[PDB]
Amino acid sequence: AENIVEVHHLKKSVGQGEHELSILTGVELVVKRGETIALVGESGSGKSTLLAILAGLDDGSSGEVSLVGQPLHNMDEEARAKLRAKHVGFVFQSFMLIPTLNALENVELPALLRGESSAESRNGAKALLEQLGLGKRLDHLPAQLSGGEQQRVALARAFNGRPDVLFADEPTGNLDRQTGDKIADLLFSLNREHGTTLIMVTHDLQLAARCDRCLRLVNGQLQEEA
Amino acid sequence: AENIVEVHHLKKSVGQGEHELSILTGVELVVKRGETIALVGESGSGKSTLLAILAGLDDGSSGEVSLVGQPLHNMDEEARAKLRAKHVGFVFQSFMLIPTLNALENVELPALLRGESSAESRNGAKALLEQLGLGKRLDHLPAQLSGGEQQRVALARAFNGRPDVLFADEPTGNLDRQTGDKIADLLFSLNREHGTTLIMVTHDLQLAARCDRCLRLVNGQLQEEA
Amino acid sequence: MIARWFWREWRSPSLLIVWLALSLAVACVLALGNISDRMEKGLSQQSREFMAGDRALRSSREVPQAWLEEAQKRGLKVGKQLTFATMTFAGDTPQLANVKAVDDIYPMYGDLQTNPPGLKPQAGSVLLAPRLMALLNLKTGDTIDVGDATLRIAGEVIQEPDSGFNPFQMAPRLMMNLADVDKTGAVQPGSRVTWRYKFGGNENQLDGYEKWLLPQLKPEQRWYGLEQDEGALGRSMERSQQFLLLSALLTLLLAVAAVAVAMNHYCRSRYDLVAILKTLGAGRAQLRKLIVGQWLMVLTLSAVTGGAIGLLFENVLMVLLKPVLPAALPPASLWPWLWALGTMTVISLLVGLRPYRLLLATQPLRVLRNDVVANVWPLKFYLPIVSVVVVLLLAGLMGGSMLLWAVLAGAVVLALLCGVLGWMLLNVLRRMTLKSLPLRLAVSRLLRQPWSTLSQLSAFSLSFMLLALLLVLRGDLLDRWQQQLPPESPNYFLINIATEQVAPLKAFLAEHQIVPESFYPVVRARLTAINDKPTEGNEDEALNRELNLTWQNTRPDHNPIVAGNWPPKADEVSMEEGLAKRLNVALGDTVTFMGDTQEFRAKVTSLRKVDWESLRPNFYFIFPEGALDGQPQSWLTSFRWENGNGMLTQLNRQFPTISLLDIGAILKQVGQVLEQVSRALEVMVVLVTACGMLLLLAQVQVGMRQRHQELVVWRTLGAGKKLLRTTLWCEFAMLGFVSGLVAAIGAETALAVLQAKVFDFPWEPDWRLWIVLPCSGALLLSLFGGWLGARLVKGKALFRQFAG
Ligand SMILES: Nc1ncnc2c1ncn2[C@@H]1O[C@H](COP(=O)(O)OP(=O)(O)NP(=O)(O)O)[C@@H](O)[C@H]1O
Ligand SMILES: Nc1ncnc2c1ncn2[C@@H]1O[C@H](COP(=O)(O)OP(=O)(O)NP(=O)(O)O)[C@@H](O)[C@H]1O
Ligand SMILES: [Mg+2]
Ligand SMILES: [Mg+2]
DSSP states (O other): OOEEEEEEEEEEEEOOGGGOEEEEEOOOEEEETTOEEEEEOOTTSSHHHHHHHHTTSSOOSEEEEOTTSOOGGGSOHHHHHHHHHHHEEOOOSSOOOOTTSOHHHHHHHHHHHTTOOHHHHHHHHHHHHHHTTOTTOTTOOGGGSOHHHHHHHHHHHHHHTOOSEEEEESTTTTOOHHHHHHHHHHHHHHHHHHOOEEEEEOOOHHHHHHSSEEEEEETTEEEEOO | OOOOEEEEEEEEEEOSGGGOEEEEEEEEEEEOTTOEEEEEEOTTSSHHHHHHHHTTSSOOSEEEEEESSOBGGGSOHHHHHHHHHHHEEEEOSSTTOOSSSOHHHHHHHHHHHHTOOHHHHHHHHHHHHHHHTOTTOTTOOTTTSOHHHHHHHHHHHHHHHOOSEEEEEOTTTTOOHHHHHHHHHHHHHHHHHHOOEEEEEOOOHHHHHHSSEEEEEETTEEEEOO | OHHHHHHHHHTSHHHHHHHHHHHHHHHHHHHHHHHHHHHHHHHHHHHGGGTSSSEEEEESSOOOHHHHHHHHHTTOEEEEEOOOEEEEESSSOEEEEEEEEEOSSOSSSSOOBOSSSSOOOOTTEEEEOHHHHHHHTOOTTSEEEETTEEEEEEEEOOBOTTOOOOTTOOSOEEEEEGGGSGGGSOOOSSSOOOEEEEEESOHHHHHHHHHHHGGGOOTTOEEESSOOSSSOTHHHHHHHHHHHHHHHHHHHHHHHHHHHHHHHHHHHHHHHHHHHHHHTTOOHHHHHHHHHHHHHHHHHHHHHHHHHHHHHHHHHHHHHTTTTOSSOOOOOOSHHHHHHHHHHHHHHHHHHHHHHHHHHTSOHHHHHTTOOOOOOSOHHHHHHHHHHHHHHHHHHHHTSOHHHHHHHHHHHHHHHHHHHHHHHHHHHHTTOOOOOHHHHHHHHHHHHSHHHHHHHHHHHHHHHHHHHHHHHHHHHHHHHHHHHSOSSOOOEEEEEEOGGGHHHHHHHHHHTTOOOOOOOEEEEEEEEEETTEEOBTBOOTTTTSOEEEEEOSSOOSSSOOOEEOSSOOTTEEEEEHHHHHHHTOOTTOOEEEESTTOOEEEEEEEEEOOOTTSSSOOOSEEEOTTSOTTSOOEEEEEEOOOSOSHHHHHHHHHOSSSEEEEOHHHHHHHHHHHHHHHHHHHHHHHHHHHHHHHHHHHHHHHHHHHTHHHHHHHHHHTOOHHHHHHHHHHHHHHHHHHHHHHHHHHHHHHHHHHIIIIIOOOOOOOHHHHHHHHHHHHHHHHHHHHHHHHHHHOSSOGGGGGGO
């Protein structure tokens, strides 16, 4: 697949009756393989909604989404889950962590879902977590961590599967300058040494500038900005 | 009294046995009326813990904590709760919004606790929320909103508290430059008008620069930065 | 890894309360069912002691021997009683006497009180009631001419278990052996030989033999049990038995409610987790494995601990109940285990099936953002199907007893009223303005989430209705039993009293410090026909017996009057409602009675509900005063005495013609039965009410766990303890008040149907229940809520527990 992500006049609205509310009003987007694109926009512009749509986690009112060259709309839930497991890594905005699993098991979970070995996945997750400087909180529960630690845990969970395409929502939202720079370096190194396309939604100007393309989302329309 | 917050030899550790971990290793901090102090530090340095113990939400391992001339280590839970309801406003990292009730009730809460009429509190909360720039999402549930909207809802609740002392955990965590600037203007206008002491744990350098004092948390110790 | 994850989940408050509630429900049902079954078996064993047989077969002629041969092959013990009353001659003194021919098996159970004791009917020997040879002027060891035989007087018959009361008696009892029937030479194929057959053995053998013999019967032979001869004392036992079953059913219903709500909450707790798993590409296979594995592990752990707790409770309770029980009860059957495990499993599956499929077919982001989930299996179609399946299963388990149908009718009325009242209350409260802050908070909280509130309200209403129904039924049964056997009662009866002798004896009764009682004048006859149709041929016990009639000027005090009007005028007689029903007669029917060639006609104008349980004589027909002067007007009276018997001898010398009957043995017999039944009811009521209170506590705890986050936020903001306690008080008080108000109507309806169909007691709308149930329910719920809220709010760093 030359273009991993293909969007064609996609619209999405929420609410019923008078409570109806439109968000996306026709989006055209083509994402060549290996590219780095950063989405920007004001709060309440639907960036998280579009990102969720692109991964198949939701369905818009109408349009065409061709993630890795597949008709997502003409595809049941099970095949969507299978495809996401094979090729897609996702990051939430609230870190959506399971509160009854420590950090190590939380990172390990995708491998177990894919049926990987306990030992090899375990050492890989350990390497990933110490790579993020969380080596002293391996057994901590999510309630024992702070915002930065939880965000880094979510990022490690995303990185574990080594997916072809990686979606990130505010990867460096709750991090200081140096830690954010380190995380950005890790992401870009992953893309460079693995050809992994990655789509970030962030308010960081430097992180967006380091990306190949910067798209502003205004009125449910995507326009190149920088 | 003039000494709003007095902290002497504050020490706090968490965990049990092998799981025991020390966070605060002797903290001293004196603040006066109307001052604006920004608190910075590396992730996992314990800033949220220090903020929580300052407001009396918990108990330190050892030390002396006085708020508005009351030694916080020398009353039970009920007196602490009464003091919090009387004077303190708080904004958390996760905002702990109640998912059952919509935004308007969440902002309404403190006014009802104070004891105003339901209609008066309703219209006051509505006016404040419209002021914060959320006039079109009044009936939305917390899940229906986004990160920025949830943060602004928490800020609206704290403001409606109309407090003598305001504690904030990353007020502009999930906000761009624009909304962050408006939020900062709101906070500083509030400080100028009502003379409300402001404590905030922030990562933005601009907000810290705007603040009166800047304190860095290193090794469970406070260091003046400027 | 998976094990540690499961254990960590199992320690979270939500899963912990779910497991605790399920285990409590299992323990509830198992222990209650086991105790009920064992106690009912003990009651049946006790009842076997006064019948000399577990089952009775009644006929007016000999049954083929093949059935008894089958029973013996079926490993069953059989006794036979084939006798009637006939003439006897103590030399040249004719005397009517009720003989009783029994085999050597009789008395199969119980004891035969004889003077001297230890005597049984043997060939050439007869045992006679003390009055019989008191009148016949014969003594023990002598010889008496009966029919065409001369048999030796072996001894007396003080009492036999299958005696009954028979106040309208005429001739004493003469025990005698089955093998000597032909040697009497007086038995005629005329009047019924009162063919009775007693069968004894295990329950399975009796049931199989009954099923085998059911098609081999004719409409003159009745198969029954717990129906003694003459007096219907066993009816009380039957009532008690029904009550026990009802109690079990109640517990079951209670358990179901709790499980439902608990499991519902559990399912909600899983929502987001499933979404996350669906996000990480968890396929259908792995997702099913994980989720149903957690569910099944919870079910299995709950069942195991529930079984252990129930067994411990049963053992410790039976140990602690040693003084009350007369003997060790037999082991229980296995059906309580089904009644527990099956109900918990089926209710769990029914509640959890819909959310599972709903989650499996909805995009994860919609679940997370609380958006519109997939419209599959709408509640409007799911709920009726679930209710139908549940009620069908309940019919299968119960066996189509009217108790279950009455309970279901009550529940349906309760649910309909609950919906209507909830809608009206919501409409009222949306327009209502208050002033008290805790009240405002409680009202707002109740209004914010209507459907969850309605579910909680319905569950509480069901629980309250069940408890109130049980309590009122227990009260009514206890009152009825107390009235049946007064603490003092006439232990002596006088029969064969001439009219002109009424005045002397009364004075003597006034003389010998004895309170006189009613003096029912009795006339014996037979009804010739009804509506001119000769009744000869119809199979009714009344037709082939000497019916007794009386005339009362005024209303019968202890005998209630239900249908018609009182008093009946000339050619109209009040009749028993049950006899009218079994005889298929209407008011004003032309009924003619033949007696002493003075057949008189009368109509029907009133029906009285007559209970054939009290020792007081009861007559089917009450003629108008002075209507049957032609017939010989016999008289019968009763009195109570407790010290000495010389005055009895003085009376016997005074009126040797009047017969005196002692019933102290019957009173002793009935006293033990009544005491044991009352102990059974007390223990069952205490157990059920305690365990229902426990289930109510579990439901309230779950309900508060639902509102945990709001409480934590309130506390963080700085709400005082007083405010939180008051708000919880007010909210749960209103909830309990409305719930009890609905439960009042539901319980009234179910109770009315049950009384009119099962326990045949009059139903009166008791406003006392209307004023007691709601207030008590509101108080109970408020107490529980206040205590649990006070327990929860205590602690430190509550804001950290918000995430949980
Ligand atoms: N489930 C929903 N129901 C109704 N409205 C919704 C829902 N989800 C989102 N919205 C609305 O759509 C807007 C966009 O949502 P979202 O995709 O989170 O915006 P965003 O650009 O990601 N905001 P932020 O995360 O603050 O930068 C929200 O701000 C709401 O106004
Ligand atoms: N309950 C706990 N048990 C053990 N360790 C804990 C617990 N809570 C916090 N910690 C540790 O204490 C550190 C400080 O937590 P916190 O007070 O949130 O720091 P912070 O400065 O707010 N971090 P951030 O918000 O990410 O910049 C955590 O990062 C953990 O290492
Ligand atoms: Mg967003
Ligand atoms: Mg923090």
